Design a protein around this nucleic acid. Structure first.
Ligand SMILES: Nc1nc2c(ncn2[C@@H]2O[C@H](COP(=O)(O)OP(=O)(O)CP(=O)(O)O)[C@@H](O)[C@H]2O)c(=O)[nH]1
Ligand code: MET
Ligand SMILES: [Mg+2]
Ligand SMILES: [Mg+2]
Lengths: 267, 110, 470
RNA sequence: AGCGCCGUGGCGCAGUGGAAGCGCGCAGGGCUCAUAACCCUGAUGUCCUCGGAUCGAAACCGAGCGGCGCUACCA
């Protein structure tokens, strides 16, 4: 079962950008299911549908698919929403798609957990969702942290240890992402002996390949030597390759040859 | 379509007409290009490219386009130019293709 | 039942395999025809000259079987800059019964010392009479520096003329005169287009060829029809190479020297750099004998410019890690052949067309580098390689002071500036340093029709020396 | 050879974590006296092939196939 809106309230807020799945259209307008929030329909007026002049209702509505939306007025006694689609800026739709994708990933993960445990999704959200959103501001960022740092599940009471264990199993199995930091060094050496110097620089660079960050010097052509690292934190590899650059410069300068930098370490 | 049709002769020869062959100078040809002033260019089945006038009883009575088999009468005093006399509506053209009055290298089929 | 590879291995073992050279043979007793020298190293360099879109790599692979790379994804079909390399072992059939013309045969590098005679009915083997290295020269109007350097390296020549096209080809005359410049008369003229040529038209074309080569220094150059696509008329080429071309004077008392035409970086990608190789100088030894593990230095070396505009020349010191012939690792070097000397030189130093025509001298010998050279030059009356429509083929002008001219000093392609002009001598100022050891015959080219055009020969008589910084 | 890119339904593209996509084509229908414009509905797949997790794979990944681009012919 799919219920229990991600955000703070089942009913929407004022001027909150929303995220629609259209179901049918009447003469007045479109009554549309809201997927960003739990299940409650919104009314999109015909005069407030299309940026262009209205000519083809079904060409733009696309019954059975998802789209962006904006809320204008809300009813806080029984539940009613006034919605618009014309007034969506060129850039806001991008943040809308990313919010949809992350919220839908979280929804799918927790719906998987609820289906495995046969407990209503609302209870699992009661034990997992919004205390996590209070701690970190986004459940997906906290999920990534729990992938890295397991202190995320500290201070929260789960219904059972099995729930957290199987949630960790699923997140490790599905939310598995290491960034390839790649740099290019041009050896412009003209000295007497460089192959020995190249080997010594090779050893100096490769010895600092840590347990979690293994830096390897790949060879493609004569001048261009590639330096490859798998940066898990993305803030340590650049220093590793800078140290490698210092080492290779130290090795090369004293022997007689020269080395030049072509591509510094970057993501 | 239009209100023009009721002003016409109403000459309804829809049933299959008997196709007309070539007689001592009348020869078959193929429309190659459409020109202006009601004149067409016809490649005749003799290796020549004659200039054929869209002709009386044919001007605004039948409408003809590129790549249409055609019957055209020559002029003995001037061989280069000629006159389109009859048009075959792509069915008896197949029959002539099998009988091969024209070289079969000119293959024009829909 | 036996696989063809097993048959080839059995023939190779029966043929003697590839005997390994002794670590230290008695050098004074060795000759370029000795078994320990001939089995694994060539002794005569034969160059190929011809017009573009004529076919020389095809002729080379018809003769030798070793293909030229024709690389760089844009030089694959049009032209090549670096010279091609090929290796053919010349074999003769000992049996007196088989006719002499087909007794000889050029076989690949991995061929056995005594392979079976492929002629049906003859159960004889083959005797290795000579090993030669076939090198392709670029016959293109702008591609002259590499062509002239190769001609300097070459000891024998092969001119290719297409019968069906125009009889007088000016680029063929260019290459022939360039060869005449550097004291090489062993030229075997070969007609590429004999399949598509008529009975009397071929005779007329041959008569025209004989008419053209009358006043040149080369007089008795053999002329032989060959095929490049049908791959016939190769044995006669081997016979003519053996007979008309004797061994150039090259023995063991002369000082060891090297002339490098091409450089290679030995670094196979994908595999980790832990297992790599140094830098390769592809050079011919026109004089001297080398061994395993020697101490050498490239005399011109690195060229650098100071803030004061002074040209500094750094002799590239290098320890010879190994020397590679066509087939396998050798232990001593036979003079008069192209060898890949794999030394501790940087693969980056051997990356681009850097070590193109540079002289290398072993430790204990001092080739002299020069900035300003006192040269003695001889010109010709008419420019060669110009297609005039029947009006007084281009006339050579006397050289003017302060003119940039391309001088190929044996192997070094330098842009010289004229300081003064005399009746037969001149002063050349070089921004790119160049060396001089004994003679180093020089090819002169001028920029007239937007490209280098050969004008004549020259010899160095003096030079302003510069002392390299160690 | 390595690395970067990719895998139409006919072509150009899109989301790839919830299962066939859009636009341009093509067929049929609609508006119009008639055509174009415009409107409506389809009929086309192995989103390249072999596997792993999974209610789910085409995606996420890997055990490979094929085509493009940089290093560049890498003795
Ligand atoms: N029909 C025919 N083609 C030949 C013959 N000889 C050579 N060719 C053609 O020459 C073409 C290329 O040969 P190739 O040796 O690589 O060219 P090249 O002469 O080295 C170019 P450059 O002169 O600049 O060095 C081949 O495609 C071949 O068809 C021949 O005898 N007959
Ligand atoms: C520069 S040619 C050197 C030949 C050697 N066998 C390598 O390749
Ligand atoms: Mg009527
Ligand atoms: Mg070649």
């Amino acid at each position: 079962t799919s219920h229990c809106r991600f955000y703070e309230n089942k009913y929407p807020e004022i001027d909150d950008i929303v995220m629609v799945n259209v179901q049918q259209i009447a003469e007045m307008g479109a009554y549309v299911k809201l997927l960003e929030y739990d299940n409650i329909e919104g009314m999109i007026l015909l005069s407030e549908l299309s940026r262009r002049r209205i000519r083809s209702i079904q060409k733009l509505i696309r019954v059975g698919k998802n789209d962006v939306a904006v809320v204008l007025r809300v009813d806080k006694e029984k539940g009613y929403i006034d919605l618009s689609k014309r007034r969506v800026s060129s850039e806001d739709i991008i943040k809308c798609e990313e919010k949809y994708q992350k919220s839908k990933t979280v929804h799918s993960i927790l719906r998987y957990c609820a289906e495995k445990f046969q407990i209503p999704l609302e209870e699992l959200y009661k034990t997992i969702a919004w205390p996590l959103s209070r701690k970190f501001g986004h459940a997906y960022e906290a999920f990534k942290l729990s992938i890295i740092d397991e202190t995320v599940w500290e201070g929260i009471e789960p219904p059972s240890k099995d729930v957290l264990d199987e949630l960790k199993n699923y997140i490790s199995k599905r939310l598995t992402p290491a960034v390839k930091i790649r740099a290019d060094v041009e050896v412009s050496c003209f000295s007497y002996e460089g192959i020995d110097a190249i080997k010594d620089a090779l050893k100096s660079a490769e010895d600092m390949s840590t347990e979690q960050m293994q830096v390897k010097v790949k060879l493609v052509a004569a001048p261009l030597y590639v330096l490859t690292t798998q940066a898990l934190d993305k803030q340590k590899g650049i220093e590793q390759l800078e140290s490698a650059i210092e080492k290779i410069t130290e090795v090369i300068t004293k022997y007689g040859g020269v080395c030049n930098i072509t591509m510094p370490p970057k993501a | 379509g239009g209100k023009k049709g009721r002003r016409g002769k109403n000459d309804s020869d829809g049933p299959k007409r008997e196709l007309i062959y070539k007689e001592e100078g009348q020869e078959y040809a193929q429309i190659t290009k459409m020109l202006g002033n009601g004149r067409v260019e016809a490649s005749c089945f003799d290796g020549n490219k004659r200039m054929a006038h869209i002709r009386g009883k044919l001007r605004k009575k039948v409408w003809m386009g590129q790549g249409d088999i055609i019957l055209v009468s020559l002029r003995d005093f001037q061989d280069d130019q000629c006159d389109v006399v009859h048009k075959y509506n792509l069915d008896e053209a197949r029959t002539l293709k099998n009988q091969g009055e024209l070289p079969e290298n000119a293959k024009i089929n829909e | 039942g036996e696989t063809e590879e097993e048959k080839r291995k059995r023939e190779f073992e029966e043929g003697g395999g590839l005997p390994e050279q002794p670590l230290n043979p008695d050098f004074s007793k060795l000759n370029p025809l000795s078994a320990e020298i001939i089995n694994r190293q060539a002794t005569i360099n034969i160059g190929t000259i011809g017009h573009v879109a004529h076919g020389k790599s095809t002729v080379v692979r018809a003769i030798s079987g070793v293909q030229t790379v024709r690389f760089k994804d844009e030089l694959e079909r049009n032209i090549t800059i670096k010279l091609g390399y090929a290796n053919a072992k010349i074999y003769k059939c000992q049996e007196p019964t088989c006719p002499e013309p087909d007794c000889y045969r050029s076989f690949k590098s991995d061929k056995e010392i005594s392979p079976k005679c492929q002629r049906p009915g003859c159960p004889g083997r083959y005797k290795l009479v000579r090993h030669v290295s076939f090198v392709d020269c670029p016959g293109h109007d702008i591609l002259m520096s590499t062509m002239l350097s190769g001609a300097a390296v070459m000891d024998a020549a092969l001119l290719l003329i297409a019968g069906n096209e125009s009889c007088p080809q000016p680029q063929t005359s260019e290459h022939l005169a360039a060869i005449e410049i550097m004291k090489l008369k062993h030229v075997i003229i070969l007609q590429n287009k004999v399949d598509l040529m008529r009975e009397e038209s071929a005779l007329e074309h041959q008569k025209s060829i004989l008419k053209f080569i009358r006043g040149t220094i080369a007089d008795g150059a053999p002329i032989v029809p060959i095929s490049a696509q049908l791959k016939y008329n190769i044995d006669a080429v081997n016979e003519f190479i053996v007979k008309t071309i004797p061994v150039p004077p090259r023995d063991f008392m002369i000082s060891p020297r090297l002339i490098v035409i091409r450089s290679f970086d030995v670094n196979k990608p994908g595999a980790e750099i832990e297992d790599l190789k140094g830098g390769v100088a592809g050079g011919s030894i026109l004089n001297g004998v080398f061994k395993l593990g020697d101490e050498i230095e490239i005399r011109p070396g690195i060229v650098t410019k100071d803030d004061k505009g002074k040209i500094q020349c750094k002799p590239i010191f290098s320890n010879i890690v190994s020397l590679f012939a066509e087939q396998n690792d050798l232990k001593f070097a036979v003079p008069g052949g192209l060898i890949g000397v794999g030394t501790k030189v940087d693969p980056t130093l051997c990356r681009a067309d850097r070590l193109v025509g540079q002289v290398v001298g072993a430790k204990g010998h001092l080739p002299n580098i020069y900035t300003d050279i006192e040269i003695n030059y001889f010109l010709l009356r008419r420019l060669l390689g110009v297609k005039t429509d029947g009006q007084k083929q281009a006339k050579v002008r006397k050289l003017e002071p302060n003119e940039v001219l391309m001088v190929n000093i044996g192997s070094t392609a330098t842009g010289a500036r004229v300081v003064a002009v005399k009746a037969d001598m001149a002063r050349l100022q070089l921004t790119s340093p160049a060396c001089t050891e004994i003679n180093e015959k020089i090819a002169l080219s001028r920029r007239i029709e937007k490209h280098w055009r050969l004008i004549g020969w020259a010899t160095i008589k003096k030079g302003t020396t510069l002392e390299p910084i160690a």
